[PDB]
Design a protein around this ligand. Structure first.
Ligand SMILES: [Zn+2]
Ligand SMILES: [Zn+2]
Ligand SMILES: [Zn+2]
Lengths: 86, 86, 86
């Protein structure tokens, strides 16, 4: 469900923010999570992060905009809390 | 082939045990290997490891239980040896 | 487009050579890039790197041969520069 998606993305971002995983690990993990649920635009945003064209804050902003366009309410709160933590 | 799958999974786990790769790298690599061979339940178990809901030992235990119902004998030996190393 | 593919592969190899990512991260990233563009032989070569049967130089060599067979010209230049940087 979309609750487990939000929980997993929030957990991955939490491990990134505590220093347990680095930027490439975060990119790979979050892109895999997004691909496993069928959301490809978010996967493209994480692909842009993985390449290096954007940073974590930019990726979070574009992910929040895409979630707004997709109506993923549980993921919007996770992304906003992550944005304010950075 | 199933022997090559067992060889690659064993090599990845041996890399993790020595200290060459960490938990996230091992999760991503083993999930990729399992997805490349069409074993989806094993992929879900490695996904739970990547999320953070289980550890390496628990993942090995559930992987062995799932490989028992699949008839992957070489993978069973690989997982048993990896379990006893831990 | 094949220009974006070559750009991303060159960028990933450049991060590897600068030392900001390691061998497993490079393998995962380059395999993901190759799979996202529908090139499977390149993906198999990167998979062989991921397991540990070949190193980065050998992978770059076989990737160059595969790109010669596929007629991808920008990838050839990227791989040649990466080979000579090693
Ligand atoms: Zn991708
Ligand atoms: Zn998965
Ligand atoms: Zn693969």
């Amino acid at each position: 469900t979309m609750e487990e998606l939000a929980r997993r993305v929030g957990r991955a971002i939490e491990r990134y923010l505590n220093g347990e995983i680095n930027e490439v690990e975060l990119a790979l993990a979050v892109g895999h999570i997004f691909r496993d649920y069928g959301l490809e635009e978010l996967h493209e945003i994480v692909d842009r992060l993985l390449a290096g064209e954007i940073s974590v804050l930019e990726m979070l902003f574009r992910l929040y905009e895409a979630a707004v366009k997709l109506g993923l309410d549980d993921l919007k709160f996770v992304l906003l809390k992550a944005i304010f933590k950075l």
